[PDB]
Symmetry: C2
Subunit: 221 residues, 2 copies
């Protein structure tokens, strides 16, 4: 499904208890290409993306950059603090603004309102089961199902309703979109060609219009 | 990298609040092949595998078994209960498999009585989702021998028994089943396994595997 957001994580937090964190929320602004955190850091902070776009990347073999995710407003960047950083977070847009707080403040705050952790537990529960079926999926899903799943994921988080459906301004490179799908840009470009000639989508340079999201859902399984 | 266990979720529970739940823990025993729960069922229970081994499978639309994971003693079977059906079926691998389970109502009233435990059950779920993100990161960078090494290491770390020659892993899986956990063809996985045996890293004993040199699998899994 959809990654962690502040709204989903803080939906059951009463307003007065959420107020207490605002003094401890730091605000940072990043320029294009600037790293918000790096792979393997040990700061143990919780970052909230407020404005802009961020990509979780992964420099590994031969120092080849590997796109893992792109994120938008309201989403938690990376993992919840408790374990070094599994990935690097790079600001896509200039004046990318993130709010963050140290883990000590969060755990003290959760200690003050332990009923909040009960409802956040249902969020990590619902997200870990969704994360598990994503792991089984990449074993048993062909590339059109994986393409349909990425386009649906991007549409639900970046989608703009247009006349013929939902436009998806992903603004990735053809290699990048293929990295999210999980195969070569050759295989993915052909799968996009099939989706287009079936009438399901249209390729708008670095945007994609989804004419028939209901068909992509069925193709996902 | 380890799936959820009772001890990991309940390490921070004071002894008093763990005793209050024993009134509501039901005990069921299953023989080999029996389903503990089925895919698409809507029970809101938390299952704890106490003794035996269990596999999580999902049946596709042409009724072919898809092996997702296998579990051993101490682990939570399937998902943790939540107020929104089960995404998989749990099948007993061993005879007289014993599971303990409690209804979500009992769990949530108990979390309500002791909300402080959910704070630290939150941090294990957080560190556990971090583990899966590391796992998804591997499958794009790992070739077939790396995933085979990691799969055999994962099985060895949970149901492995140290012997003088190394670690005996009585996995009891078919070549098709093991290849589904590795994530590629039965032929491709069998040949990678053969390379491991030819190199002296493992030996294939029926459906048990001795890992002569587990440290070699560690290096290869990177
Ligand atoms: Na693996």
């Amino acid at each position: 499904d959809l990654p962690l957001t502040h709204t989903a994580l803080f939906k059951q937090v009463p307003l007065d208890q959420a107020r207490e964190l605002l003094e401890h929320l730091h605000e940072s602004v990043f320029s294009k290409g600037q790293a918000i955190f790096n792979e393997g850091d040990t700061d143990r902070r919780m970052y909230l993306l407020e404005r802009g776009r961020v990509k979780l990347v992964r420099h590994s073999r031969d120092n080849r950059v590997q796109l893992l995710s792109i994120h938008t407003h309201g989403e938690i960047l990376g993992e919840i603090p408790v374990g070094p950083r599994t990935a690097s977070a790079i600001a896509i847009t200039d004046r990318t603004r993130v709010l963050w707080l140290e883990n000590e403040v969060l755990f003290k705050w959760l200690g003050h309102h332990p009923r909040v952790a009960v409802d956040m537990l249902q969020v990590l529960a619902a997200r870990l089961r969704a994360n598990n079926e994503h792991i089984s999926d990449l074993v048993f899903m062909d590339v059109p199902a994986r393409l349909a799943k990425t386009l649906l994921n991007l549409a639900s988080r970046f989608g703009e309703p247009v006349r013929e459906g939902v436009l998806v301004p992903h603004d990735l490179t053809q290699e990048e979109l293929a990295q999210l799908v999980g195969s070569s840009r050759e295989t993915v470009n052909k799968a996009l060609m099939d989706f287009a000639q079936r009438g399901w989508i249209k390729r708008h340079g670095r945007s994609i219009i989804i004419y028939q999201p209901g068909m992509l859902i069925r193709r996902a399984e």
